[PDB]
């Protein structure tokens, strides 16, 4: 006995338009922003640790560790200038999530990304759990000050190669991303404890589910809740080495998990098409892209 009448994208679409599916949680990772030109900052193929010789770090990872950053922030900000995107244009996937919001289906979007594209696409603070923080805002690091600065201010400092200092107290100003050694956001744990009591559908897009504790969110869904993965590669299955709550797409025991393998944009397009939303999504994307291109 299962909520999906078949373990396919078509089964998921029929379930979404049934009275049983009211509340959708999206879990998204780097795979939803690669088509916007944003690289996967956790992939070794990105080479974040490769050309740091001129910074004389005690070890490669120090560039992203909070205690090192606070005393030697220049390497991080030099790297941030080199990797700073040329444009912030959200993808079809981001705008699919905006449509979910528009239609009253979006309970929450948990994101591993720091690129701000969920916000640009129209998800509001209350819709989002930025599990690793964001570049959208930055804060003075002094506990007694904590002056907030917008991304436009931070970008100007990064591009002029001036280490960002607080105008009120002259302390370092840090983008609101979670550095290694920093606490994960309290909001991540608070929202998880409430949201997963309420979820009817998990949409997992563009994440290989390899980074904890984000990956463990799939095990927080009720046992009946269908879980759709839209991703270039299958992910989330229990590790035959390591291994509880893993994806089961393909066994005779499979009952609720569905994998659609391909580009995230094409998967969301296909799902929107099944839902009758394709024209709405095309119109939204073309309009928002036109607006961003015209800034």
């Amino acid at each position: 006995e299962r909520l999906l009448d078949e373990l396919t994208l078509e089964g998921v679409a029929r379930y979404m338009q049934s009275e049983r599916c009211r509340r959708v949680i999206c879990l998204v990772g780097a795979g939803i922003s690669t088509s916007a030109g944003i690289p996967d900052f956790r992939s070794p193929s990105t080479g974040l640790y490769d050309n740091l010789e001129k910074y004389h770090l005690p070890y490669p990872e120090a560039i992203f560790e909070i205690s090192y950053f606070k005393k030697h922030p220049e390497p991080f900000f030099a790297l941030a200038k080199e990797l700073y995107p040329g444009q912030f244009k959200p993808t079809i996937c981001h705008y699919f999530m905006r449509l979910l919001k528009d239609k009253g289906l979006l309970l929450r979007c948990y994101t591993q990304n720091i690129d701000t594209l969920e916000r640009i696409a129209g998800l509001e603070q209350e819709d989002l759990v930025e599990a690793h923080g964001t570049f959208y805002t930055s804060h003075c690091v002094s506990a007694s000050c904590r002056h907030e600065y917008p991304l436009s201010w931070m970008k100007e400092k990064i591009f002029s190669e001036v280490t960002p200092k607080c105008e009120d107290c002259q302390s370092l100003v840090k983008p609101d991303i979670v550095f290694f050694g920093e606490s994960l956001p309290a909001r991540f744990f608070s929202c998880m404890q409430s949201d997963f009591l309420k979820v009817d559908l998990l949409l997992v897009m563009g994440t290989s589910l390899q980074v904890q504790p984000f990956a463990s969110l799939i095990s927080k869904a009720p046992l009946s809740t269908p879980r759709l993965l839209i991703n270039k590669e299958k992910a989330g299955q229990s590790d035959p080495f390591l291994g509880g709550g893993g994806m089961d797409f393909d066994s005779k025991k499979a009952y609720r998990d569905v994998a659609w393998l391909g580009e995230c944009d094409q998967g969301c397009l296909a799902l929107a098409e099944l839902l009758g939303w394709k024209k709405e999504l095309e119109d939204l994307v073309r309009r928002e892209h036109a607006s961003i291109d015209a800034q």
Binding site: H132, F179, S183, L184, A186
Partner: peptide, 7 residues
């Protein structure tokens, strides 16, 4: 609160 690590 749990701190951010490699894993």
């Amino acid at each position: 609160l749990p701190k951010k690590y490699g894993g």
